[PDB]
């Protein structure tokens, strides 16, 4: 498996939709609105708000902080490296009671069951869960009620080393000497050993 | 799989626990080093294979776990109960990472907790023996 | 089962399938849990129960029950002549998986003690008291609900392994084991029909038999 | 019971009500003016500011600071959950005299009474108050005092997972050998255990 | 019910103590492990049951509480008796979320609080001995 | 050359490690000093040469590497079997830029690791004895 | 090179056809002979002369832990010797098996000689059993 | 496998029909034959004979608290026996019950020996008490 954030949010989006569905509001589709935050296509087509209530999803970053390196090892003739990855998301509800919606989404992904399902469809697990703000902003005419919260991924990302080769055969020579830098040796030993 | 803190899973005594401190809230340790080595005079070594393997296990609970009344209660039954009888149990910890692959073969309760009553809720520590602390191994 | 016999058919031959007498009988259908003790008073007297008296005062599993002495019973002897059982007629009880008191110099002495499907008595017994400490213990958190009933997530599963690993630990206090493994289905591995069905599978565990020594072969030289 | 911070803050309010009601001034149905924050209804609505003194309760966040979860145990035949929270809350006095009614507050909230009516409409409890500031601000024309202060919550909330499930049958399979890997096992034990 | 500060209630001598410092104002502890364990040099483990069960209490208040008249007071008397009189008392603890689920059989007071005097008022720490520290249970 | 952390191979038993921690991955110290001096009432030295070359090698991974896994699985192996075989092999360090120049000539695993089980992923530390820590050096 | 390791985990002893086990925390046996095997006499002139002494019995002292099951065996053999007649033997070999080769010797036709002090506080106090023996043989393997 | 463990609070002892108590912090009581059991000797030759001591006396001493109430209870019993005439009795089974099982000895016909020695300072000091015995017994469970 390769880590592509971009593959972590379409899995959470999709796990979010049977989650905590059912307090959103719905599209014209009946799909609860739930979507990827900047949301464009075709390069410059740009979405519209949805109606609320609805949930937004961003991918902050990742990072590293497991060492370099995690494994290296040889599935079939060729070179694999594994490597350990940190990857912190955002998720934010807008509309009213967004704070009402947030701590009973806090209190499902805590369950033994919904951890199962996100690592079924994105292949990570949940580290951690930070606090949840409640906050105001203008826009214009009223306030809208928002309130962003933390969830930390952990997971293991491979990849093929299409540049590398295994050793397959050994050749080995040797000496034995009385004195350091005798000239000519007193024996020598020559060895082959082939992988078959 | 990897790592992550809310998989962990310790029973002992049939009971299954939870409530866990935020950080540190498990700790395992062997009493004796493996292999003891004598170095003489002359440069020599010799190594001598303790035949010791007892531990320590170490749990943090918050103050207002419910394990805690649980514990606090098998305690005072074994108080009450002649030396025939045995207070040994399995301690099993389960992770799906394997980062913890080992268990208690006979854990017996050895100290209570203390008690610290400051601003916010402290933590509880709850320490275990065992006679043989095994460090078991995913590879054959 | 402990049953005695005193058909003198049972000492000739030594071939299993032409045999017809009781004892050959049992042993054609690898009844286990059959004991046959040979001894010619068998017929109104009932030396059987001095042998369960043996093992039965004891702990299971921690004792083995070949080269027995018992108390007053005599040598198994012939009814012909009165005379021990010869080295002919022990070996065609060995091959009937039949008990007898055979002699030492002067001293009678119940020797194998297996039961008739050629199993040792304290592997019987043993798995026998295993098999129902296993069972209390369980039942304590199945029906007595000690903890409170237990979830079909890794947290309960784990909670069945702390069980069993206890029982199979206990065995290995008595000496009766020396090892022993304990495997668990993950619970996101479990097929979603047992889940509404609530009966957990595939639990399964091994152990290693401690022994024992009966016998002794010895050999040696003298020179100058 | 679940935790919801919209049925927090009106069990603070009416729980003032009585508590401090005697300091405040009076609207036209002769209740204290007590409100919550940012005031607003039917979507766009938006609340005008009451006659002074009175008093405004926000809700900042919710955070859990003891651990992830607290408990897990069957009631009934369904799974639960348990979750410890804690909830800044923050009061404000708005008029003259703002210091001198906030610190009355203040020596109330810590008597042995009161925080029981708090527990008997909220059911949380009191866990910290901090200091009270006297600020001042301009606004137009005239200065307005005011007297903000935090008291802090501690509530447990318990949920529901009906994904879950209990076992009721244990089914066991053994074996015994000599020696490890002995392919025809000596000994097989096979158990079956009901609830029942 | 969940843990708050300010439902702690401790009493002893038939007087309520109050002016808790903000932190840290009460800590618990035995004496004694429960059980001390023996290993031989074959590896065999034995257990020894600790007949010890005394215990330290300890509660800190503000320098300028009333209740530090009162126990000097009661330090005071206790100095112009004969031995034939007694001077233990329990000491109960109350706390309405079962945090600290314990109490002092024979509780006597043991040392003097240090003084001291810098810019802020400060705290004094009362010590106090008990014959037996139990740790009861709220479940059967 | 210069030094990079991601050049650095160690090898013992003819199996790779790797996932080592972040930061201080690995450490090395001789058990005695080359020289113990000795002084008189008058001022004289004397210089004692001692025979002691043993020493340490610490060596830390991340809890979820897989090569905790083999070392579990070697010292499970090492403890079902009898005196007379050996359990020594060389524990070689590679290192490009020549910053480590030392090698165990005959390492013995020594030291379980320390288990805990904090917030986020932790460290486990290993420990191995050498008979003799050679330091050798890349100039004639 | 590096000698053979030692480990106290695999040593067994056996007296009297029971085996005793139970070993104490440190110190758990102890061997030695009675006198020295060459006693020197040196004249007044400087002259040396060697006595070569033919006593050769020994003792061997072995310490278990307090509540070890093996305390019990001793003492219901020791409380069987104590009814039996004078001519019935009461001495066997005491065996030693170490396959680290650290212990050298044997016990010839051994006897016990004297029971454990007990002693009970808050800790545990290992006992001490005593032994002789009429030949304390020192064997080793060929150079 | 684990031996049974150790409490020294299940420990009663016995003696003349009170029961004392109160131990000492540490080192609380003392078991300890007089003679060994057995004393070889050995001829200029090497052979070897053994002698069978017939002496089986013991002592048992017993430490208790400064303050302890059993202190007074032993001085009472002392003071009685004094002013006894010879031709009565002073002599009584010393009893230890141990359910562990650590302690193997009994007194037959025990009988007190030597008073505390009394000393006093800033701590507090233990008293201790000897005892003879007819015969210390040994006995066990049969193994």
Request: charged share 20%; aromatic share 8%; with cysteine.
């Amino acid at each position: 498996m390769q880590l592509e954030t971009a593959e972590l949010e379409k899995g959470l989006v999709r796990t979010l939709v049977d989650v905590i569905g059912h307090r959103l509001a719905r599209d014209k589709n009946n799909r609860p609105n739930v979507i990827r935050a900047y949301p464009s296509d075709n390069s410059n087509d740009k979405g519209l708000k949805p109606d609320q209530p609805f949930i937004t999803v961003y991918c902050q970053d990742a990072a590293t902080p497991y060492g370099w390196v995690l494994d290296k090892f040889v599935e079939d003739d060729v070179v694999c490296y594994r490597i350990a990855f940190q990857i912190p998301v955002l998720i934010t509800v807008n509309g009213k009671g967004a704070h009402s919606i947030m701590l009973e989404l806090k209190q499902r992904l805590e369950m033994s069951s919904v951890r199962d399902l996100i690592l079924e469809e994105t292949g990570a697990t949940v580290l951690d869960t930070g606090a949840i703000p409640n906050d105001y902003t203008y826009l214009n005419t009223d306030f809208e009620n928002s309130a962003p919260l933390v969830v930390t991924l952990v997971k293991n990302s491979v990849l093929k080393d299409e540049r590398g080769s295994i050793i397959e055969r050994v050749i080995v020579d040797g000496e034995l000497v009385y004195e350091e830098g005798q000239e000519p040796p007193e024996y020598t030993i020559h060895l082959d050993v082939d992988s078959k | 799989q990897q790592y992550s803190p809310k998989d962990v899973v310790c029973s002992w005594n049939g009971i299954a626990i939870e409530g866990f401190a935020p950080d540190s809230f498990l700790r395992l340790q062997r009493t004796s080093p493996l292999v003891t080595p004598v170095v003489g005079a002359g440069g020599q070594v010799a190594l001598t294979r303790n035949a010791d393997k007892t531990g320590t296990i170490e749990i943090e609970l918050m103050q207002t776990s419910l394990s805690n009344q649980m514990l606090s209660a098998i305690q005072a039954k074994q108080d009450n109960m002649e030396l025939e009888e045995d207070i040994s149990s399995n301690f099993v910890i389960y992770d799906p990472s394997g980062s913890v692959l080992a268990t208690g073969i006979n854990a017996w309760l050895q100290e209570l907790p203390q008690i610290e009553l400051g601003r916010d809720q402290n933590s509880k520590t709850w320490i275990f023996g065992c006679e043989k602390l095994d460090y078991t191994s995913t590879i054959p | 089962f402990f049953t005695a016999n005193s058909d003198v058919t049972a000492l000739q031959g030594t071939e299993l399938a032409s045999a017809n007498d009781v004892p050959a009988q049992l042993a054609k259908n690898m009844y286990t849990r059959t004991v046959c003790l040979w001894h010619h008073a068998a017929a109104e007297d009932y030396p059987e129960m001095a042998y369960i008296a043996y093992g039965a005062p004891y702990d299971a599993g921690s004792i083995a029950w070949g080269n027995a002495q018992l108390t007053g019973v005599a040598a198994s002897l012939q009814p012909s002549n009165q005379r021990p059982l010869t080295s002919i007629q022990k070996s065609a009880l060995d091959v009937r998986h039949c008990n007898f008191i055979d002699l030492d110099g002067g001293v009678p002495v119940v020797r194998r003690g297996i039961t008739s499907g050629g199993e040792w008595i304290d592997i019987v017994r043993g798995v026998d008291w295993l098999e129902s400490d296993l069972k209390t213990s369980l039942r304590d958190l199945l029906i007595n609900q000690k903890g409170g009933k237990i979830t079909y997530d890794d947290t309960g599963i784990t909670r069945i392994r702390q069980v069993i690993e206890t029982s199979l630990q206990r065995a290995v206090n008595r000496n009766f084991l020396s090892s022993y493994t304990v495997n668990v289905p993950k619970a996101s591995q479990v097929a979603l029909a047992d889940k509404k069905a609530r009966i957990l599978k595939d639990v399964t565990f091994a152990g290693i038999l401690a022994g024992a020594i009966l016998d002794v072969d010895l050999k040696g030289t003298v020179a100058y």
